[PDB]
């Protein structure tokens, strides 16, 4: 009954910026806590950012604080993630997720993956170093 | 006629009426595969308690009485008194002693006992299986499984406090408890009596709205979902006010108290249950950051805005 | 201005606001020897919550959060969340997380935990000593003694459900728990902050009226008397109604519903406590077969009929 | 505080009658549960009868049903035990009693001596043969 579709993001040079978006559709409810996650091939899915339905409480992983900005527009059913200062470390699939059980931006388990109940297919972000793989 | 109204507590601030735990969210979805006939948390909007419903939020799934040991076992039979230590009369027109569990499962808690001759006390882990043949609260008889064969005395006040539920064995996960399967209140092969009626959506495009908690788990992989038709505070409020029902359906509005935003619409039925305009085979869960507000009396043909 | 009113449930039907158990009687007597300063069940008549008082009747003396095992023992430290699972903010102008026990004693219950990956559950006997040096709820940390040293995972939802009090310090002694001794909320050798004030009779010829329950005993010979200043249902009602106080003292009358007889008179004070006209050195216990009825606002100079 | 004073115990022939009374004084409360007990020398105290403050529910020990009748008058602050058809087994000291914690005439522990918190000093009934 729910599909989250994230867009934006592709290939960017080390130091560049991107703007991700995530659109909600289906039998949704506006109070759901939402956030951003990322996963690289062969690694574990990790928390990136979260924000409540009132934009009251924003949460950031230590590895993205200062560079990233999470934002929410409920009337457009869209969540945003403005990324700056991208390093090759940030190469991953970026997923938006939503927890139907919780609304508080200070919900103490808001960084755990298994607490979120709806997930998008993800958008690929690739940051290329000045020194290419070989 | 006294004006009808609804408590302004948020869902987050209210108590499940089928187990002594706080409410955590709202839930709506298809219940066509079940008979939704809970006995606790049943009350008319003008204040008539039904089923096995009483007024205390903590006297739910509790047992009180005296105990008799079954030799060669760690099991105890509890001869039941009512929730206020009155004699329990099996001929009262109720399905079971008020507050009796209304679902099949293994409920874990503690049996406490105080000896009145010197104030000595004791507590032991205890489990009651409301599906067992020796589960007969309507007859005044319930069996508990404990971890001792000696420590409890006869003819002394004994109380069971519920904590949570368990699932055991090598069976499928979440097979147990079965929250929509009423126990046989008089033991194996007997018919239940004086039940609050089963509920189901009537007007098409509507489904039942449940006040949901998560029962604590004590062992195994239990099904900890517990939906109730009315918050226990709503049961307390309707009984107190006893406001006459101007129609069969009260229209309520779900309002976030910080924003003042109206988030959805619903129908409170005179017999004490709620339907919403939700459709399909999936479930919809609603965080508990809102309170219900009575706006006007309507009839069962009022068309709700889909939520 | 909304008219003031009190719930019409009898004492028998209401819940103690300092422990999740039903009220059993009323109690009045001299209490000048104690400092009566409980932090739960504290609410003004216009609905301002005080101390550590929250709205749920089942979230009293409960704890929620995650646990870290103290190596070399069967003990666990619980890093606390609020009762609604939010991050606990120790900088809130409260003495401790809402619902914290407000008395020194050994509280027995069960620690349950759910692993969020597979839904596996577990529960263990647990005791919290609210007088222990590592009882620091205001700093966000509480210690439990369990019956295990391995079967609890880190970073998983864990809950403590209270059952009763135990007693193994002075054995037969009724010297514990001590219901009028506040814990050191920030731990050993710290001072409490933002307390709800202590209460005492002001008018000559008056004593405090208490709403009394008997806590279940789980071991030994505990002092199970628990007196609260307000039923938890009154806290709920005042918080919702939020009716302005036209006077510092509401005049209530204790009425038996089966007969309509007034059994005595009493003053409900704006700050959230009750006094009666009674002045022996002897105690008086009243069975709970009655409700309270607001009749009119009066001044502090009103002289109540003795009982 | 509370004083309980029972009267009316004499010597009687087997098969005789006797009317016991009990008067409550002091800091009583009108709604307490009340009852009669008895104790013979060298034996344990045993329940006889009980009655709520409204006379809604009467309770009798099996060994006295049909011969004894319990009665309560709040306006006189008095409880009565009408006794007929006495036997030598009825010889004991009879005690008035009241439980400040309960009110219900069907309190499931109403037959227990320990549940009661106030007591008379006793009246002596002796039935000879």
TrEMBL record, chains B, C:
Q: Where is the Calicivirus coat protein C-terminal domain?
A: 82-307
Q: Which residues form a coiled coil?
A: none
The compartments listed are:
Host cytoplasm; Virion
Q: Which residues form the signal peptide?
A: none
Identify the GO cellular component terms for this protein.
host cell cytoplasm; virion component
Q: Which UniProt keywords apply?
A: Host cytoplasm, Virion
Q: What is this protein called?
A: VP1
Q: From which source organism is this entry?
A: Norovirus Hu/GII.4/Sydney/NSW0514/2012/AU
Per the UniProt record, the lineage of the source organism begins with: Viruses, Riboviria, Orthornavirae, Pisuviricota, Pisoniviricetes
The shown residues of the full protein are: 224 to 530 of 540
């Amino acid at each position: 009954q729910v599909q989250l579709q994230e867009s934006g993001g592709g290939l960017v040079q080390a130091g560049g910026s991107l703007n991700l978006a995530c659109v909600s559709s289906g039998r949704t409810f506006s109070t759901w806590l939402m956030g951003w996650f990322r996963q690289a091939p062969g690694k574990e899915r990790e928390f990136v950012a979260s924000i409540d339905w009132r934009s009251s409480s924003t949460t950031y992983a230590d590895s993205v604080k200062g560079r990233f900005t999470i934002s929410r527009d409920n009337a457009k059913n869209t969540m945003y993630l403005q990324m700056t200062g991208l390093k090759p470390e940030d190469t991953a699939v970026y997923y938006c997720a939503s927890d139907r059980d919780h609304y508080s931006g200070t919900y103490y388990g808001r960084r755990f993956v298994e607490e979120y109940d709806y997930w998008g297919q993800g958008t690929q972000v690739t940051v290329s170093s000045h020194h290419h793989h070989h | 006629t006294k004006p009808f109204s609804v408590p302004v507590l948020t869902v987050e601030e209210m108590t499940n009426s089928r187990f002594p735990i706080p409410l955590e969210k709202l839930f709506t979805g298809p219940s066509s595969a079940f008979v939704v006939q809970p006995q606790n948390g049943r009350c008319t909007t003008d204040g008539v308690l039904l089923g096995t419903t009483q007024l205390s939020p903590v006297n739910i799934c509790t047992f009180r009485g005296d105990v008799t040991h079954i030799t060669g076992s760690r099991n105890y039979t509890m001869n039941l008194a009512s929730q206020n230590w009155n004699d329990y009369d099996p001929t009262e027109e109720i399905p079971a002693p008020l507050g009796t569990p209304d679902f099949v499962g293994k409920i874990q808690g503690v049996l406490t006992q105080t000896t009145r001759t010197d104030g000595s006390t004791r507590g032991h882990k205890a489990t009651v299986y409301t599906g067992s043949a020796d589960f007969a609260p309507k007859l005044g008889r319930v069996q508990f499984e404990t971890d001792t064969d000696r420590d409890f005395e006869a003819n002394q006040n004994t109380k069971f406090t519920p904590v949570g539920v368990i699932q055991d064995g090598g069976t499928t996960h979440r097979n147990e408890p079965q929250q929509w399967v009423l126990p046989s209140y008089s033991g194996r092969n007997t018919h239940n009596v004086h039940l609050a009626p089963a509920v189901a959506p009537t007007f098409p495009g509507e489904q039942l709205l449940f006040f949901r908690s998560t029962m604590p788990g004590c062992s195994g992989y239990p099904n900890m979902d517990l939906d109730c038709l009315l918050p226990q505070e709503w049961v307390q409020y309707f009984y107190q006010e006893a406001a006459p029902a101007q129609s069969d359906v009260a229209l309520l509005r779900f309002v976030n108290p910080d924003t003042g935003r109206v988030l959805f619409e619903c129908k409170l039925h005179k017999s004490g249950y709620v339907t919403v305009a939700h459709t399909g085979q999936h479930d919809l869960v609603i965080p508990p950051n809102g309170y219900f507000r009575f706006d006007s009396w309507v009839n069962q043909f009022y068309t709700l805005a889909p939520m």
